[PDB]
Amino acid sequence: LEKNVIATQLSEEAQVKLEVIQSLLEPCDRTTYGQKLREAAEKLNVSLRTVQRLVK
């Protein structure tokens, strides 16, 4: 048996979250995760735990 889901055209908030996810797609260093997660919290204006929930 088979299953899949595909996103339609993204909303503007989902576009911003796509740029944040792309900003968090590159790194390999724990220091750089901490830096880019905190800048992403500032870019989204959310808590650091909120950005962690978004990545998850």
Helix (H) or strand (E) holding 46: none
Q: Is 39 in the site for DNA (CB under 7 A)?
A: no
Q: Is 4 in the site for DNA (CB under 7 A)?
A: no
Q: Is 30 in the site for DNA (CB under 7 A)?
A: yes
Cβ burial, residue 40 (10 Å; 0-12/13-18/19+): buried
- Out of 10, 14, 34, 42, which residue is the one contacting DNA (CB under 7 A)? 34
Residues that bind DNA (CB under 7 A): 30-31, 33-34, 37, 49, 52, 56
